[PDB]
Amino acid sequence: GLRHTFVVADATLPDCPLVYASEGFYAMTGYGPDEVLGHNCRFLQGEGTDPKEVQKIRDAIKKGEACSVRLLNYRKDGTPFWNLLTVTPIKTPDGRVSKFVGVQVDVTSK
Numbered sequence: 564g565l566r567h568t569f570v571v572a573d574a575t576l577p578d579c580p581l582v583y584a585s586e587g588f589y590a591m592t593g594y595g596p597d598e599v600l601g602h603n604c605r606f607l608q609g610e611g612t613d614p615k616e617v618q619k620i621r622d623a624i625k626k627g628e629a630c631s632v633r634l635l636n637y638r639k640d641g642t643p644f645w646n647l648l649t650v651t652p653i654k655t656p657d658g659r660v661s662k663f664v665g666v667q668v669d670v671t672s673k
């Protein structure tokens with residue numbers, strides 16, 4: 564989908580914290596860099612987020628593999644939205660994962 568957001572997480576640190584987010588990520592979610600750089604993206608989850616979809620992502624990250632999931636997420640103001648998320652590992656020439664990138668699409672309106 565054409566409208567989307569983009570983030571980079573640092574896989575060389577144990578909890579894959581965010582190191583970069585696009586202008587649209589901040590604007591869509593309602594958070595700014597001074598609130599979410601250095602943090603794992605799970606802050607977007609909440610009461611209704613499907614733990615089985617969360618587990619798929621967790622498992623893909625541990626295996627250094629790409630994954631696509633649909634997750635209920637929440638803006639800073641607590642309002643929900645449907646996030647079609649695709650995460651992709653970025654490797655060094657030795658095959659180790661350095662970064663994960665994420666593309667989010669708000670698919671609430673279909």
Ligand SMILES: Cc1cc2nc3c(=O)[nH]c(=O)nc-3n(C[C@H](O)[C@H](O)[C@H](O)COP(=O)(O)O)c2cc1C
Binds near residue numbers: 621
């Ligand atoms: C690059 C990247 C982007 C991510 N973007 C989101 C996101 O937009 N929304 C979300 O709920 N989780 C997102 N995650 C998933 C969480 O950061 C975390 O990996 C997931 O919740 C599973 O780990 P946990 O069980 O320790 O929370 C993203 C992860 C990575 C690596």
